[PDB]
Protein backbone atom coordinates (compact mmCIF):
# COMPACT_ATOMS: atom_id res chain seq x y z
CA UNK A 1 0.00 0.00 0.00
CA UNK A 2 2.69 2.51 0.99
CA UNK A 3 4.60 1.43 -2.12
CA UNK A 4 1.87 3.14 -4.16
CA UNK A 5 3.25 6.45 -2.89
CA UNK A 6 6.69 5.57 -4.27
CA UNK A 7 5.06 4.46 -7.53
CA UNK A 8 3.20 7.77 -7.87
CA UNK A 9 6.37 9.71 -7.04
CA UNK A 10 8.33 7.80 -9.69
CA UNK A 11 5.55 8.39 -12.21
CA UNK A 12 5.59 12.13 -11.46
CA UNK A 13 9.38 12.23 -11.76
CA UNK A 14 9.33 10.40 -15.10
CA UNK A 15 6.53 12.65 -16.38
CA UNK A 16 8.28 15.86 -15.32
CA UNK A 17 11.81 14.96 -16.46
CA UNK A 18 10.74 14.95 -20.12
CA UNK A 19 9.43 18.52 -19.91
CA UNK A 20 12.43 19.57 -17.82
CA UNK A 21 14.77 18.35 -20.56
CA UNK A 22 12.69 19.65 -23.47
CA UNK A 23 12.12 23.19 -22.18
CA UNK A 24 15.88 23.84 -22.12
CA UNK A 25 16.17 23.21 -25.87
CA UNK A 26 12.93 25.15 -26.33
CA UNK A 27 14.48 28.17 -24.60
CA UNK A 28 17.65 27.75 -26.66
CA UNK A 29 15.74 27.73 -29.95
CA UNK A 30 13.54 30.64 -28.85
CA UNK A 31 16.42 32.88 -27.73
CA UNK A 32 18.42 31.86 -30.82
CA UNK A 33 16.66 34.64 -32.74
CA UNK B 1 13.03 -0.55 3.31
CA UNK B 2 9.87 0.36 1.38
CA UNK B 3 9.44 3.49 3.50
CA UNK B 4 13.06 4.46 2.79
CA UNK B 5 12.55 3.90 -0.94
CA UNK B 6 9.39 6.02 -0.82
CA UNK B 7 11.27 8.79 1.01
CA UNK B 8 13.91 8.61 -1.74
CA UNK B 9 11.12 8.79 -4.35
CA UNK B 10 9.26 11.97 -3.34
CA UNK B 11 12.49 13.92 -3.91
CA UNK B 12 12.86 12.55 -7.45
CA UNK B 13 9.46 13.96 -8.42
CA UNK B 14 10.26 17.18 -6.53
CA UNK B 15 13.65 17.57 -8.22
CA UNK B 16 12.10 16.87 -11.63
CA UNK B 17 9.40 19.47 -10.93
CA UNK B 18 12.01 22.04 -9.89
CA UNK B 19 14.06 21.38 -13.03
CA UNK B 20 10.92 21.65 -15.17
CA UNK B 21 10.01 24.94 -13.48
CA UNK B 22 13.49 26.36 -14.10
CA UNK B 23 13.55 25.26 -17.74
CA UNK B 24 10.01 26.56 -18.32
CA UNK B 25 10.94 29.93 -16.81
CA UNK B 26 13.95 30.03 -19.14
CA UNK B 27 11.66 29.19 -22.07
CA UNK B 28 9.18 31.92 -21.11
CA UNK B 29 12.02 34.44 -20.80
CA UNK B 30 13.38 33.44 -24.22
CA UNK B 31 9.91 33.73 -25.75
CA UNK B 32 9.38 37.17 -24.21
CA UNK B 33 12.79 38.29 -25.50
CA UNK B 34 12.00 36.92 -28.97
Amino acid sequence: NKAREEAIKQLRKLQAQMKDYQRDLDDARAARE
Amino acid sequence: NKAREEAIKQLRKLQAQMKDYQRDLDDARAAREE
Binding site: N1, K2, R4, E5, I8, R12 | -
Partner: protein
Protein backbone atom coordinates in the same frame (compact mmCIF):
# COMPACT_ATOMS: atom_id res chain seq x y z
CA UNK C 1 -7.52 -2.65 1.09
CA UNK C 2 -8.77 0.36 3.06
CA UNK C 3 -5.29 1.89 3.09
CA UNK C 4 -4.84 0.91 -0.57
CA UNK C 5 -8.09 2.63 -1.57
CA UNK C 6 -7.23 5.73 0.46
CA UNK C 7 -3.91 5.95 -1.39
CA UNK C 8 -5.74 5.32 -4.67
CA UNK C 9 -8.12 8.20 -3.95
CA UNK C 10 -5.10 10.39 -3.20
CA UNK C 11 -3.68 9.34 -6.58
CA UNK C 12 -7.11 10.11 -8.07
CA UNK C 13 -6.99 13.67 -6.75
CA UNK C 14 -3.47 13.87 -8.19
CA UNK C 15 -4.98 12.76 -11.51
CA UNK C 16 -7.51 15.57 -11.14
CA UNK C 17 -4.59 17.97 -10.73
CA UNK C 18 -3.19 16.39 -13.89
CA UNK C 19 -6.52 17.11 -15.60
CA UNK C 20 -6.06 20.73 -14.55
CA UNK C 21 -2.64 20.46 -16.18
CA UNK C 22 -4.27 19.22 -19.40
CA UNK C 23 -6.60 22.22 -19.27
CA UNK C 24 -3.60 24.53 -18.90
CA UNK C 25 -1.93 22.76 -21.83
CA UNK C 26 -5.02 23.26 -24.00
CA UNK C 27 -4.97 26.94 -23.03
CA UNK C 28 -1.32 27.11 -24.11
CA UNK C 29 -2.16 25.35 -27.38
CA UNK C 30 -4.88 27.88 -28.16
CA UNK C 31 -2.55 30.73 -27.18
CA UNK C 32 0.09 29.38 -29.57
CA UNK C 33 -2.46 28.96 -32.38
CA UNK C 34 -3.66 32.55 -31.88
CA UNK C 35 -0.17 34.03 -31.33
CA UNK C 36 1.75 32.63 -34.31
Amino acid sequence: LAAKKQELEEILHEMEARIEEEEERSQQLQAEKKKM
